[PDB]
């Protein structure tokens, strides 16, 4: 309840620490590996989130390294960071001061689901489009998030702005460097991870995004289950068993299936589900990792055409959030897509 003054380092640019005062600190929740507090900046009265993570005495903090590089309207901004000490000894905390966003896609989806109500497809379009932009941006640095789930999609439901958060699982993936998946990609686990791949790529995030889309269309997870084994049974119910070629594309080291055919995608979702949403989902939830759309290709899909209509508005009458403020970095995987992604009225 008292005023706390720290010397905090701005997230972006070289280190230029500033005195920052905040107050009204209270626990509001958690990320995967840190408690999240709300606080009010004394200067502007603005609410911020402070994620407190343990600082290793000998190793750099990877989440901080990644977040200092990022600046995108669909990724939670690292305003500042600072260190604090408990009474223990070697007990040091890294404090990440983040923009505060009050709700998540999961909360809105769960509200609609528990009410037996379909989430309006305009919101599905807006949320998924903004997720795909955030992925296009991080993937352009080689950074894979590895924990894409609806609880990590922050949302202001009135403006419909979505921000990806929680980079505690994220890593730069480099061709030829093996990677593991013990504490990450547990929520919507891509099948190559279930099959034990250590050479996986950022397309694991696109699989997760496909699971988010399917959940928003169905009102429940498409592949529920705690373990990868459990999720795989559920994956087979829809996709059938992977072919020998798909297994080789997922994990060429997987030595040790009956042929079970896929279930038609139109029969997975309720009648009246928009056909383009089903088409999009079928190009995300693919066994072969290289067959999945890239994030930028997904943004350009016909499912998002309504967002490119000149007269589109939110249901509350407000303008849509920013959709066309692309950068070179974000477009870098396929700059010619800019012609389609940004209609003439938007540039």
């Amino acid at each position: 309840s008292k005023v706390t003054t720290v010397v905090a380092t701005p997230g972006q640019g070289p280190d230029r620490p500033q005195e920052v005062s905040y107050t009204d600190t209270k626990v509001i929740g958690n990320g995967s590996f840190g408690v999240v507090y709300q606080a009010k900046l004394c200067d502007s009265g603005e609410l911020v989130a402070i994620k407190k993570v343990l600082q290793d005495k000998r190793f750099k903090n990877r989440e901080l390294q990644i977040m200092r590089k990022l600046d995108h309207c669909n990724i939670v901004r690292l305003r500042y960071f600072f260190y604090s000490s408990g009474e223990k000894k070697d007990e040091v905390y890294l404090n990440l001061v983040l923009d505060y966003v009050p709700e998540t896609v999961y909360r809105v989806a769960r509200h609609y689901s528990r009410a037996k109500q379909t989430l309006p497809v305009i919101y599905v379009k807006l949320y998924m489009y903004q997720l795909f932009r955030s992925l296009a941006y991080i993937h352009s640095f080689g950074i894979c998030h590895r924990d894409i789930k609806p609880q990590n999609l922050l949302l202001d439901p009135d403006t419909a702005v979505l921000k990806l958060c929680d980079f505690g699982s994220a890593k730069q993936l480099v061709r030829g460097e093996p990677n593991v998946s013990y504490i990450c990609s547990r929520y919507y686990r891509a099948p190559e991870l279930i099959f034990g791949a250590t050479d996986y790529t950022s397309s694991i995030d696109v699989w997760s995004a496909g699971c988010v889309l399917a959940e928003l269309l169905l009102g429940q997870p498409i592949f529920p289950g705690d373990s990868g084994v459990d999720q795989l049974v559920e994956i087979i119910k829809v996709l059938g068993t992977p072919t020998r070629e798909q297994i080789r594309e997922m994990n060429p080291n997987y030595t040790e299936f009956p042929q079970i055919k896929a279930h038609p995608w139109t029969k997975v979702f309720r009648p009246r589900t928009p056909p383009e949403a089903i088409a999009l989902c079928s190009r995300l939830l693919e066994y072969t990792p290289t067959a999945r759309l890239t994030p930028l290709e997904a943004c350009a899909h016909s499912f998002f055409d309504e967002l490119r209509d000149p007269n589109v508005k939110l249901p509350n009458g407000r303008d849509t959030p920013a959709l066309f403020n692309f950068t070179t970095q974000e477009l870098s995987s396929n700059p010619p897509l800019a012609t389609i992604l940004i209609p003439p009225h938007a540039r």
Binding site: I28, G29, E103, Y106, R107
Partner: peptide, 13 residues
């Protein structure tokens, strides 16, 4: 409600 949530409270509870 029930499940795994980011925040303790929600207007959508």
């Amino acid at each position: 409600x029930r499940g795994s949530f980011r925040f303790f409270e929600s207007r959508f509870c």
